[PDB]
């Protein structure tokens, strides 16, 4: 595994860690999710191109689709909670406990 594969894996790990830590905004976490999606796309594309897996070339494109379907979902949710609180702070999501 050359430096490129390790750098892409590190990018995915950084995006996942940034998602797992919440500061205030939900939009920043959605941005981290988009970053994870981009890192996965890049790694899959590199792996498929390196081995000349011809059919698998359609795999990353499909990977993109369910990307924004996940994004369009989150943004949608981000609207509604805002309509309840006037802000997208994840602090306000504390009505339900363990």
């Amino acid at each position: 595994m050359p430096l490129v594969y390790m750098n892409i894996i590190m990018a995915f790990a950084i995006a996942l860690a940034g998602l797992l830590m919440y500061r205030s905004h939900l939009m920043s976490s959605l941005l981290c999710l988009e970053g994870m999606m981009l890192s996965l796309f890049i790694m899959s594309t590199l792996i498929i191109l390196n081995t000349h897996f011809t059919l698998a070339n359609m795999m990353p494109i499909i990977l993109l689709v369910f990307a924004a379907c996940e994004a369009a979902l989150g943004l949608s949710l981000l609207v509604m909670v805002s309509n309840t609180y006037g802000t997208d702070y994840v602090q306000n999501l504390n009505l339900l406990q363990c």
Binding site: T51, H52, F53, L55, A56, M59
Partner: protein, 105 residues
């Protein structure tokens, strides 16, 4: 769990994309078509447990083709020994390894 509707009906919903040696468009071959074909032929019909131990040679060759780790190690050793021989100066690499070669078609 796994309800094999594809095998029951012969539908082939996603079995065309599972391996790289299976009917690529314009007959374009994978980088490791021979290795994967050999390993699949070795491991066919003997179960996972038996294939993990008896087809280990073909799988090792396939992984070597896929990642080329041992080849990179060999090349790194070659270039390190070449650098050590050049630093003290008793190698003098040949002219065709420096750009003074008479190329062929």
């Amino acid at each position: 769990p796994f309800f094999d509707v594809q095998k029951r009906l012969g539908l082939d919903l996603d079995r065309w994309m599972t391996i790289q040696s299976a009917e690529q468009p314009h007959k374009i071959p994978g980088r490791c078509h021979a290795f994967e074909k050999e390993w699949i032929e070795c491991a066919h019909g003997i179960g996972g447990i038996r294939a993990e131990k008896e087809c280990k040679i073909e799988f090792d060759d396939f992984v070597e083709c896929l990642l080329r780790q041992k080849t990179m190690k060999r090349l790194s050793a070659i270039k390190r020994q070449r650098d050590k021989l050049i630093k003290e100066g008793k190698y003098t690499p040949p002219p065709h390894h420096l750009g003074k070669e008479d190329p062929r078609p």
